Symmetry: D3
Subunit: 275 residues, 6 copies
Amino acid sequence: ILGDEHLLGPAEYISSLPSKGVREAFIDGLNVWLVLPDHRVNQLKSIAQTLHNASLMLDDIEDHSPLRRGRPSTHMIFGTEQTINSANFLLIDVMEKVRQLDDPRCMDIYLEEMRNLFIGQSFDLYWTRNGECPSEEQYLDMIRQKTGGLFRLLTRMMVQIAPVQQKGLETQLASLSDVLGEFFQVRDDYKNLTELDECKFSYPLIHALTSQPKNVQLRGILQQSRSAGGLDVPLKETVLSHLRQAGSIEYTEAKMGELMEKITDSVVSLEGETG
Amino acid sequence: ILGDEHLLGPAEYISSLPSKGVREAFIDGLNVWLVLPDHRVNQLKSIAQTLHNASLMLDDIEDHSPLRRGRPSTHMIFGTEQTINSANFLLIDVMEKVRQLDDPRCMDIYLEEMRNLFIGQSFDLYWTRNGECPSEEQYLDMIRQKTGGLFRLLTRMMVQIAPVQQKGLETQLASLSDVLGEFFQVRDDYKNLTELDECKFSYPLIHALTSQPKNVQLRGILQQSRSAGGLDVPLKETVLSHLRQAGSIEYTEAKMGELMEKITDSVVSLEGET
Amino acid sequence: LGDEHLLGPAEYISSLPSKGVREAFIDGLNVWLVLPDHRVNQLKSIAQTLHNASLMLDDIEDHSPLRRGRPSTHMIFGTEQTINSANFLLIDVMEKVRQLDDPRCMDIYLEEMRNLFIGQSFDLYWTRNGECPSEEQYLDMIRQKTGGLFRLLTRMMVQIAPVQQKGLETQLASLSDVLGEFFQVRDDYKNLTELDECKFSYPLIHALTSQPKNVQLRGILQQSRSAGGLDVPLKETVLSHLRQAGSIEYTEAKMGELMEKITDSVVSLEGET
Amino acid sequence: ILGDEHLLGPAEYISSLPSKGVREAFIDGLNVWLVLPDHRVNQLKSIAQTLHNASLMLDDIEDHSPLRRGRPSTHMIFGTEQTINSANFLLIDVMEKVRQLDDPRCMDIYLEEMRNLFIGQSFDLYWTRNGECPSEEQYLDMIRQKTGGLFRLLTRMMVQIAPVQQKGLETQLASLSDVLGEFFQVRDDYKNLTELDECKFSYPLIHALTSQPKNVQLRGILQQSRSAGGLDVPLKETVLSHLRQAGSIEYTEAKMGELMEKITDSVVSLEGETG
Amino acid sequence: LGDEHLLGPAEYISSLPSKGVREAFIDGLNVWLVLPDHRVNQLKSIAQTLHNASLMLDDIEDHSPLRRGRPSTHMIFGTEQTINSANFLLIDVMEKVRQLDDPRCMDIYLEEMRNLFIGQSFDLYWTRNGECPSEEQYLDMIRQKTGGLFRLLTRMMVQIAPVQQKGLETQLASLSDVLGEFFQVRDDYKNLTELDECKFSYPLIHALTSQPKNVQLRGILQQSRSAGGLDVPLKETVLSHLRQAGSIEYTEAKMGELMEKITDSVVSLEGETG
Amino acid sequence: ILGDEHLLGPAEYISSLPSKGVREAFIDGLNVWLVLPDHRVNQLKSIAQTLHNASLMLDDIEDHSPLRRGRPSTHMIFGTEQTINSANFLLIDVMEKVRQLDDPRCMDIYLEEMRNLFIGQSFDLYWTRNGECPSEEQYLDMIRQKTGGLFRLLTRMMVQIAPVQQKGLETQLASLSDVLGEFFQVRDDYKNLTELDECKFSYPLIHALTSQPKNVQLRGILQQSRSAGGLDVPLKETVLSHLRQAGSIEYTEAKMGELMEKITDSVVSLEGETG
């Protein structure tokens, strides 16, 4: 008995799709400050890759997206249950990968970071399903964990196995990672209306729903999206019109600029500390 | 501030349900041969309970079961996505518990038997999706990992923390765990049959399909179940009648008796030396 | 490549319990027509196969999940396989018809099959479009659709009949039509007194004709047409609407009138023979 | 009642649609060798037309095809029940036409050939519904019976009708008809692929599933087709790419060439014992 | 040209078993106001037509297959025909009100219809969007929706009343509002102890307000919204959740206070009338 | 609480979509003969606008049309129940506008006209639901009330408000309004065909079904529309071809020419009476 082809199928399929390598680029860009050996960097890149693949496999299912990068999703080639099983086993694979790093504290780092990531994802799922619009503070503290959790996990693990010296700069890099994840989430939200069908809240939408508590048209359109399975294109342009009248797209520009200013200042401070 | 109300909701709901507790009884029975402190036994009981709860939560979404033990399933109270999120987090939660047993080898054991469990469940899911009837050996090898995986996982950790002396009692206990896992699945198939909707293969239904290669009615009802999504009572009666013509029920009785003979022999051999 | 997938549905529907009206009718005719024993069994085989094919097609065309409290053929083998088996059954019945050593039997078979299909086509058109037929139209449709098998069997038995049996052609055919009409009226009475697809019946036509402005009945019938079936309270409402108009007594009167004709025809045939 | 109008409705609608006259071409082609009178030729052509119309009318129902030759199918204008009824009556009509050929053996030929046609159809339906992949030999036999059945029936009736003399060239023409029907089916399978929706097995698909008994992606896509009752375009492109990766499109062009060589040799042989 | 297809849905719901709360209320008020039988019958017809139109619209807007154990109007005539008939019923009532020989009755009718529709609009918004109203909001909604007809009839009866009974306006209006609140709370209690369209109620509002972290109840309410209603095991779970927070006792308390107010108002009116 | 947010939500939305002002132009047209003060004309225009908005709100629901003038429909933003409630209350709104005209005979004209409007709508709905083809006369009477009711109502109110000297016209103007409504309905029927997805009976379709009792294809396509829910485009071309072969379009432009001739004669007579 040497067959493990119905368990590794979805993982290989999702790993065969094209990607931008943002996490690999982040690992490489953090390696200048923390001079690490090559094989450790390859191990960290592998861990990040498989964790991202598992997250994508789960999110495809939980968002009912027939297409991923123009190509078919994993659950339309293998089924929902097999994809769920493979995603569950990917956690054990990342477990063996982290075990191979020869560091007892990477254990606790991995476990705590996964706990935070799951908390964030649970809050996002509750808000999406129950149709409850969160506040700006709640939404922004959600995306510090759901999206910035991977960056914080990789940063802490990278700092742990770095050669001594670079130990007091963990907090600076953790703050940088949180700001970076916030920037990615807000950028995604922006380049999705000026470019969801499953009633996903966004940064532009919260401002519109808060500054206008009496706007019944937007709320009714969102309710139709909820109890319809999605919106048609003419119903979609109405949401864009409402957001553009409420001035939420510029409110997103303000946040984008503030986050980039914070990123630039953090990077400048980190370069000043090191060198 | 920090409540974790939407993460632990499904876990608490499924943990607040009635249960038979076969895993806890197995642990307590093993504790006689391998003398252990209460603290370690309770830790292992918690680990087994959490793993069983996660497995139960996952196999209701994958089987489309509206009810469990007469009560509504977890995904009908919280949602499919939230239940999946909690089930995956429970794996990490147990991961933090195997680490508190103070043994590096326990994590290896965990990481190997979880792999075996996932392989078995993947094969079961593939046979359910694509209606491919496995051989009897294939089915028995699947259920030696899908169902006996928990028992083996608990057994190999208990001998690792067992105080010195008893160390050669490893192969016999593993064989006992595998035979118990096989018996507990043949028994469930027999009880479910003699007392379909998801079109899941069973031990009698493989013998029926193998001994009768030209039974078109059975193969057609099995496909109507798959396509329509479920079988009405008259169709279930037709399947049950087709299964008595091939003598599949007696074939299940014989396998149950043969398995129980192995269990008795294993117990007598283990109690002979210790 | 055998016929496991071709004779599956036919063998399944043959295995199911049945009543045996056709075989009893053949045996009853054999008293007058004194056929040899082998030919009687051949005709019973033909009648059984034709009836089984008709039931197989009607189950699909009426969306009936059950037959005699047992799963229907197309819920075990599928719609396409059942249609293919029903077509092969028609192909097979004639190979038996050609074994009766009579060229005229083929002509009889072909003409009565044409009549069968015409009647069934009118039934299907009335059901799909929701158009209520008149009394004469419905009576002719049930005279061809249900009385056609009896006619076919009667004419073949008279052709095979040993010599004589010259004038026993119009009387026996009229008896066949009357029996086929009576069976349909009796089934229509039974299915209602003690379906979901809004199938027109003798009680329903009288109600829809005698009451030109009964909006409630037509609305319930259209609800059955659209939703796909009548729940229990709507069925009770329809039955109350039928009791109000007196359709049940009309059906009883029609049954009695038909049985009078059956009795008179039997007495006449007994008188000559 | 005497109006036979709800019975011939579908039969005339399917006849009004455009066609290609392959069966008429076959009859003209064999008439050079068998030289039988003109009215018999018209009778045989009408029999072939009616049988083909009935087969198409039933196929369109059994394959859930909303369109036929661009125009709507028969069951979308008259309903499934009426279409089935008309297709059932068309057999009896063809049967009335056969008896006018004035030959008792013609009825025997017709009754024996329709049995093979129905056996082939039954195997096709069983393989389609149950999702069971046939072997190459079984598929070739099925398409030899299902598709070559009409050609075999016509060519066996033609020799019986044709003026005595020529009687020994019956087996040769039957082999020619079987090869021609197999060629037609393989050509249709290749064209539909290069230029499956209702889970139909083809010649390239069997080769793909047999050469690689580990490709879980192809099997999963085939399953998804069954579950959803059809395939989307990105999903179909994946199947086409998988087939082109296994060399099935060339394994089909080899079979087509072999069949054409067999057809040419059969025609040459049949032209050497006539003239 | 010949009516029908318009009055048919109206006649179907008119010829159905009823209770007659509105008619009894009119007869009870006539003791204090004393109106000729002609006017009383006119008001009774107006009330019957208004109640029937409200029921026809509510059955459509709640997807109720049955009413009083008999099929609903829209299940015999279709949604569109029922809507058209209910619309024409308002014009018909507008014709009856014009026959009371008073221009002020028309103003009363037009100013109570607006309140009725405002309350119904808030109910529809809360039902569709899943928003949970506050106790004050819910009690203000049912004071206009269910207490609208009682107030409308009351204010017409005191305008036609002979010997212009001075005052007897505010007291009777308050009596109508408290009766309308009592009837809705009573119906809410009866439906629970003795939803499928996800309608809110006093016990459910109390349960959702007292326990802001009960994720199970909110999840079940969301499941009701998604899959078009609940099932018996899930309704039992909701009932068990409501008996833990003391919602039923809260409903008894509200019912008792409402009945005390009714008794006090009635005795106050009887003291001055005699 | 002030309220009036979920009541005047669909009414304001339907009043914001672009319109053509046919009924406002009609009101201005008759104001030349009936010299009325400006504010009385504005009141009548408000009444007509709100009545038309309520009718459109109701009609969109009974036709399951997701789009109105390209923009999303009212029941796709507020739901069916809320739109029904607002349309119900719009009648009570037109009530006070009519009462503000200061004329006891205008509350009477209103009720009788709305009764005929509802009778016509009821017949339209019954024919649409229970698959019943009306005759030519029944269809013409139904469209004289369903469509010409608003014109008659506005005309009678305008005559009542106008000075007593110009009150002998009425009849003339009422006949003009009936012919105008018939022309509008026939124009819409012609334009929806030249340019049954809800199985609606039009003027050409009644002729097509009446002049051809034995045409089974048209009735089958209509029943397919009834059952499935709508007609695909290849099925629409079949209906169009059947109508063209039946010569039903020329019947329609003959009807339009006759109606325009009647309108011209009526206007000429009305100008001859006045002046």
